[PDB]
Structure 1
Amino acid sequence: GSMEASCLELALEGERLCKSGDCRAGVSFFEAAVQVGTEDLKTLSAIYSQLGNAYFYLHDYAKALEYHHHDLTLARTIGDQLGEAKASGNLGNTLKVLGNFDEAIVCCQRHLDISRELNDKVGEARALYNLGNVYHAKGKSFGGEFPEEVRDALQAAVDFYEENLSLVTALGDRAAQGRAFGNLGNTHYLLGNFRDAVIAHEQRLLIAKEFGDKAAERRAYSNLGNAYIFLGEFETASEYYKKTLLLARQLKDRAVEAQSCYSLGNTYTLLQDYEKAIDYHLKHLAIAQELNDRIGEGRACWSLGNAYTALGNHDQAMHFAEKHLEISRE
């Protein structure tokens, strides 16, 4: 019946609620537990870290940063190096999302270095994935014709992801491999290594199927299609977007489905088919407005007016722009 005992109890309920996917409730329990307090700084460290992650998942990145900062500091106070490595990785990930890449890199690098010192291979691998992510976001945030420092950041990302894959292969960690393959493929895409991107997304697709992860499967098909566009193989691309459209309906994901239809219309145009294009753009706007999607609504129109203006229908084209200008002004 100490203060220590109630803090623990509140925290356990916090952890339970968060695992169940109710982060909003869990946050309050962790805040209650902080309110009650405890003299065990190890317990308190774990509560801060869970608050940081809970806020991160709720997209309150500014709060996530605050709590991961407290956790890092407290980890240093008590000399818990494993705890320090974890907090720094968490901090770097939050910094990355906020667009503070320079400090993000320093924090994620501290997570890697300490994992190495401790001979913690699981942690080392996670830190490498985190580092690939930061260098990727860093290179992508700028603005084939890239400044040297941008190409260098993207190529470091490739190296981190490949180093990660080598360790998680040794560890037998399939979900970790799925994550790395996907982001590696995206990094190759940005570098214009389109063949390598396909290879990476193919591996990512295979793992998505293994897990029965229909959403990851859907991402992979979509990324594969994008890469085939830039390889010229427009036919194969439409075939992958068709796969995503099928999946979009199974998942009952309205927006994703809008995306799938929009892409196919754009691909047929590169194939010089304008009817199919129109039918897909039609579905997109139909689903767009259905989601309170103003930006999307207009996009379809400029597309549609270009497609009718290619068909030879110079009236329905010249029409289409009119509803676009309306949403434009709105």
Structure 2
Amino acid sequence: MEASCLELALEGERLCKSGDCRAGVSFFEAAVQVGTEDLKTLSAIYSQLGNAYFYLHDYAKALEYHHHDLTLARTIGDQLGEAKASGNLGNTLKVLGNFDEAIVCCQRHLDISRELNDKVGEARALYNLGNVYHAKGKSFGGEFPEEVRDALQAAVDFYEENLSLVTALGDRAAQGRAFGNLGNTHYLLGNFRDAVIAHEQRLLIAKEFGDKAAERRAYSNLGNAYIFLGEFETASEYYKKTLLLARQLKDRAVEAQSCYSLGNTYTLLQDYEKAIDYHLKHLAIAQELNDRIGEGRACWSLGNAYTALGNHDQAMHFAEKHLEISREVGDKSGELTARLNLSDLQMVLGLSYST
């Protein structure tokens, strides 16, 4: 009783739904080998193979199977099927850096959705187009390239359209994703205030769902945007909130990054004592996760903070640690600067005594 295409297919489907796409792929592959005349099911097989490989990060294969799905959906005249495949093929092409074709695929998805009067599908396409342009914008390279700017502005436009429709459909969670990406795009463009405004909404919505991760993301984005608005005190308030959330979600890495941002922010506010505190908390966690590179960044920062406080002795110590870490990780610029900091501090000390 050799298994039928449909049976293998259903196994691959539940396998992928359980997180094990590596196995599901196997069954889907087998089902294709067995074959079927039900092209609608074969279409679903390809689509799921493409999506599974995408998840496995085998984009070349995700491309192959989404390409197949799109072709078949078109051959058998499945409109909704073509729209979905166009969107999937577009996200894949995006990852692969083929933005021109990704845009075409996602625009195709948009068109078919509007024709079928598929409002949620329309929303999904606008969001995909927004994501594609966002990626395009980041795929370039003190002049800000106009090509980066046009792409990012294109993203803002699609995100706003998606946002508009998605709030009209009452999809609160989708509004949240729209706000967050809209905020990050503005951040990269340099529209800090609008970034802040969009992120506040992302924060607002994350709280409604009790989505702690989303909430943490919003606090970090807010802090970063305020830094570039020159509003450091406001930035610190948000970095503290990310720290608490991070501390609460038991994320050591993120908690360390938060302490490091706080150290820098307080240095900008010229409160070196607090900078020291936060940089120390970051130092510890860095050592704990055995992150030498970040430990170097820590010693570098501590040395500067202590130097700014007049604490010569403590500055020496960290400059030494910095020089050490820098050489161990093979960082040239750091080695030299740590070196220059050491000899300078030694000069400051030795010259502080009469001839």
TM-score over 0.5 for the alignment? yes
Instruction: Tell me which moved more, 239-248 or 250-259.
Output: 250-259
The question of whether the paired residues in 2 share the 8 Å contact of 1:144 and 1:192 is answered with no
Q: CA deviation at 1:231?
A: 1.5
CA distance in 2, matches of 1:242, 1:230: 17
Q: CA deviation at 1:208?
A: 0.8
CA distance in 1, matches of 2:68, 2:2: 20
SS in 2 for 1:114: helix
Q: 1:33 to 1:306 in 2, by over 3 A?
A: farther
Q: Deviations over 1:244-286 (max 9, x none)?
A: 1111122122222122111111111111112222222222233
Q: 1:311 to 1:114 in 2, by over 3 A?
A: same
SS in 1 for 2:270: coil
Aligned partner of 1:105 in structure 2 is 103
Aligned partner of 1:278 in structure 2 is 276
CA distance in 2, matches of 1:195, 1:129: 22
CA distance in 2, matches of 1:30, 1:249: 42
The 5-angstrom pairing of residues 146-161 of structure 1 reads: 146-161=144-159
Q: CA deviation at 1:4?
A: 11
Q: 1:33 to 1:303 in 2, by over 3 A?
A: farther
Q: 1:284 to 1:54 in 2, by over 3 A?
A: farther
The question of whether the paired residues in 2 share the 8 Å contact of 1:209 and 1:217 is answered with yes
The 5-angstrom pairing of residues 71-150 of structure 1 reads: 71-143=69-141, 145-150=143-148
Q: CA deviation at 1:206?
A: 1.2
2:62 to 61, 64, 68: 64
CA distance in 2, matches of 1:268, 1:275: 8
SS in 1 for 2:3: helix
Q: 1:325 to 1:49 in 2, by over 3 A?
A: farther
Q: CA deviation at 1:292?
A: 4.6
Instruction: Tell me which moved more, 21-30 or 134-143.
Output: 21-30
Q: CA deviation at 1:179?
A: 0.7
Gaps of 5+ in 2: 328-355
Q: 1:95 to 1:318 in 2, by over 3 A?
A: farther
The question of whether the paired residues in 2 share the 8 Å contact of 1:4 and 1:38 is answered with no
Q: CA deviation at 1:147?
A: 2.7
2:48 to 47, 50, 57: 50
Q: Deviations over 1:106-152 (max 9, x none)?
A: 22222112222222221111111111111112122323952333222
Instruction: Tell me which moved more, 168-177 or 10-19.
Output: 10-19
Q: CA deviation at 1:203?
A: 0.7
SS in 1 for 2:2: helix
Instruction: Tell me which moved more, 256-265 or 34-43.
Output: 34-43
Q: 1:291 to 1:147 in 2, by over 3 A?
A: same
SS in 2 for 1:5: coil
The question of whether the paired residues in 2 share the 8 Å contact of 1:125 and 1:164 is answered with yes
The question of whether the paired residues in 2 share the 8 Å contact of 1:30 and 1:47 is answered with yes
Q: 1:78 to 1:180 in 2, by over 3 A?
A: same
Q: Deviations over 1:46-75 (max 9, x none)?
A: 122122222222333333222212222222
Instruction: Tell me which moved more, 14-23 or 300-309.
Output: 14-23
The question of whether the paired residues in 2 share the 8 Å contact of 1:4 and 1:39 is answered with no
Q: CA deviation at 1:94?
A: 1.9
Q: 1:99 to 1:323 in 2, by over 3 A?
A: farther
The question of whether the paired residues in 2 share the 8 Å contact of 1:238 and 1:267 is answered with yes
Q: CA deviation at 1:303?
A: 1.9
2:35 to 37, 43, 51: 37
CA distance in 2, matches of 1:30, 1:232: 54
The 5-angstrom pairing of residues 242-321 of structure 1 reads: 242-321=240-319
Q: CA deviation at 1:288?
A: 2.7
Q: 1:327 to 1:29 in 2, by over 3 A?
A: farther
SS in 2 for 1:10: helix
Q: 1:291 to 1:132 in 2, by over 3 A?
A: same
Q: 1:37 to 1:232 in 2, by over 3 A?
A: same
Q: 1:284 to 1:116 in 2, by over 3 A?
A: same
**Count of residues in Structure 1 that have an aligned counterpart in Structure 2:** 327
Q: What is the TM-score when the length of structure 2 is the normalising length?
A: 0.85
Instruction: Tell me which moved more, 311-320 or 103-112.
Output: 311-320
Q: 1:206 to 1:144 in 2, by over 3 A?
A: farther
Q: CA deviation at 1:227?
A: 0.9
SS in 2 for 1:4: coil
Which has the larger Rg? 2
